[PDB]
Amino acid sequence: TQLPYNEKWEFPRNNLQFGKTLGAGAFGKVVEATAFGLGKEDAVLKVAVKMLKSTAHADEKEALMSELKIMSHLGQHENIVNLLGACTHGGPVLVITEYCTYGDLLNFLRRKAEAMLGPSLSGRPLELRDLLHFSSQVAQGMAFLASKNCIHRDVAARNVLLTNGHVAKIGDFGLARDIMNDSNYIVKGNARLPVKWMAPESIFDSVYTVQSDVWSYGILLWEIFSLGLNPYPGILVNSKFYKLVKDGYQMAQPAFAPKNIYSIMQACWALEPTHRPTFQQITSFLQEQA
Ligand SMILES: Cc1ccc(NC(=O)c2ccc(CN3CCN(C)CC3)cc2)cc1Nc1nccc(-c2cccnc2)n1
């Protein structure tokens, strides 16, 4: 965008020691690293570093810079993936963020479920309160983005990261996601879209607002209280699916959701955008439950 990059984030690329890859897309990837003398307190930290692959070209580079500019503009919040620094001089653009010990929320829930079933068939197990905290925290992060007039457009469990103390943060893999081979992204003409997460006005009118994010959050809520099931499971995205969503078809109550939380999901799925709850409403409600 036309936003400026502030060099207050500038970090020496030689002060990074790279480790394993945390995720990889077609033209970008995220790599774990250690930063030496990062931040006000000169900390020595494990961080995440987004960068372009050798396959990337000019457009991919302009996108990575825009993402960096946006993250600066956003500010910092406990429930988003915070920008820690950047390397824009003397080499490829490097974007440095917080490292989240437990990875994405979706995989975490799935592995946790398997580990809990283990004793019967094959750290501590999840309780309902953990799910409420996760949901509450993601809502706080989304409410923060909404207060900045910032539209996420891909709210989902795969884009939520869990850090120390199991605190959920909302992020965006962007170039570091392999959408080309991801079955959660459907080929809708020009682009590949997370259709099962999208609001009807987004699907049909290409309209993205804070409210269409609220819809997608409802789908996320479903993911959490089913412990990481695919939305609309078994249902092929086609003309019938599109028409169904448009006529108010909604998923059934997840196995682990209290009627309370499922009512919240349904509210998020109001066909009329302005009838859906705000992120601050969702936040206040969930905080009390948790
Ligand atoms: C390294 C990096 C660089 C950038 C980002 N970006 C964001 O987190 C983000 C969040 C919100 C926005 C807002 N944006 C507004 C416009 N719309 C269209 C998109 C959203 C942009 C970027 C995250 C990361 N971090 C990241 N990415 C993937 C995986 C991991 C990761 C994995 C495991 C452990 N620790 C970290 N970490």
**Strand order, largest beta sheet:** 1-2-3-5-4
In CATH terms, what is the fold-level topology of the largest domain? Transferase(Phosphotransferase), domain 1
Series of H and E elements:
EEEHEEHHEEEEHHHHH
CATH superfamily of the largest domain: Transferase(Phosphotransferase) domain 1
The major pleated sheet works out as: 5 strands, antiparallel
Beta content comes to: 15-25%
Bound molecules: ligand STI
Q: For the record, give the distance between the C-alpha atoms at the N and C termini, rounded to a whole number.
A: 39 Å
Q: Quick one: how many beta strands?
A: 9
| Level-1 CATH class name of the largest domain | Mainly Alpha
Structural class comes to alpha+beta
Q: Give Rg in angstroms.
A: 19 Å
If helices are DSSP runs of H or I spanning 4 or more residues, what is the number of helices?
Answer: 8
Molecular shape: globular
Q: Which architecture of the largest domain per CATH? A: Orthogonal Bundle
- Count the domains: 2
Helix content range of the residues, please? 25-40%
Protein name: Macrophage colony-stimulating factor 1 receptor
Region (Activation loop): 172-194
Subcellular location: Cell membrane
Cytoplasmic side: 1-290
